[PDB]
Amino acid sequence: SNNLDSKVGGNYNYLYRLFRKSNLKPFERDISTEIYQAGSTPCNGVEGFNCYFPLQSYGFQPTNGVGYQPYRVVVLSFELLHAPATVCGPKKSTNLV
């Protein structure tokens, strides 16, 4: 979707977290847009004082290579839990033998 979602000069409207103190669990989102510290040196928010800040935007460019093109990925999260399954596949139900 390099002709619809990307913009000329860089679509810097969306952000994403880069570094975190701990790993995330599945089916968990991080909507916290605050900036945290990286190492032992306290930087306290804004950019400066030599910290690895996780603030980074998307480099979407339509006139660039295929490595930076925006891709509309829809993750079909299929799973098998302890609940009784109802969402089956397109198979014709036969009789009982």
Binding site: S40, T41, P42, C43, N44, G48, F49, N50
Partner: protein, 213 residues
């Protein structure tokens, strides 16, 4: 460029407590730990040189510890005259690249401000300028709410604030605001109102003065 990474950019310590500022420097200076003492309106002075000896005029309450990249300026019994900005630096060679800095604040109780509305002179209207004078002194803290009322109408544009540092005598604050007005905008209004909102009393200080006196 050498970036002097400091822990805190703004602190506050009242009288009787100990303030510890640890500046994690990105360079290894060894025993060359130096600090500053910047008075408001005066020249800066040396506070601690070589991390073990104080300057002439520095009292015994200002001590120091640490060496190299890890050092902590141990300051105990902070008084009202200890208002100074501390920079992590070195006295070995050039250039002197500094960092952000840490401002010290002495905590106290709140105080009621004094509002005095003064009209501009008649000779300023000949050139085509006007300035509404409203002063606010002896208040705490610095986050005060000053509103402008021009004939009952609230005005937000054309407000130029002027803030100062902490006082050294009784640790008070002072902030002024000048309303920039032209010749035509001043002659169409008569009564001005400068109000100050404080927390020491439920009745705010409201002052008014007529242009015709």
């Amino acid at each position: 460029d050498i970036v002097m990474t400091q822990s805190h950019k703004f602190m506050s310590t009242s009288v009787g407590h100990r303030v510890s500022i640890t500046c994690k420097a990105s360079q290894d200076v060894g025993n060359d730990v130096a600090w500053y003492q910047q008075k408001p309106g005066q020249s800066p002075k040396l506070l601690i040189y070589w991390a073990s000896t104080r300057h002439t005029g520095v009292p015994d309450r200002f001590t120091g510890s640490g060496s190299g990249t890890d050092f902590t300026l141990t300051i105990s019994n902070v008084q009202s005259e200890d208002l100074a900005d501390y920079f992590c630096q070195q006295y070995n060679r050039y250039p002197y690249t500094f960092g952000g800095g840490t401002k010290l604040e002495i905590k106290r109780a709140d105080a009621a401000p004094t509002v005095s509305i003064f009209p501009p002179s008649s000779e300023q209207l000949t050139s085509g300028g006007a300035s509404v004078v409203c002063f606010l002194n002896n208040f705490y803290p610095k986050d005060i709410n000053v509103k402008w009322k021009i004939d009952g109408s609230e005005r937000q544009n054309g407000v130029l604030n002027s803030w100062t540092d902490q006082d050294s005598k009784d640790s008070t604050y002072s902030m002024s605001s000048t309303l920039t007005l032209t010749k035509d905008e001043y002659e169409r209004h008569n009564s001005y109102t400068c109000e100050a909102t404080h927390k020491t009393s439920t009745s705010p200080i409201v002052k008014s003065f007529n242009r015709n006196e």
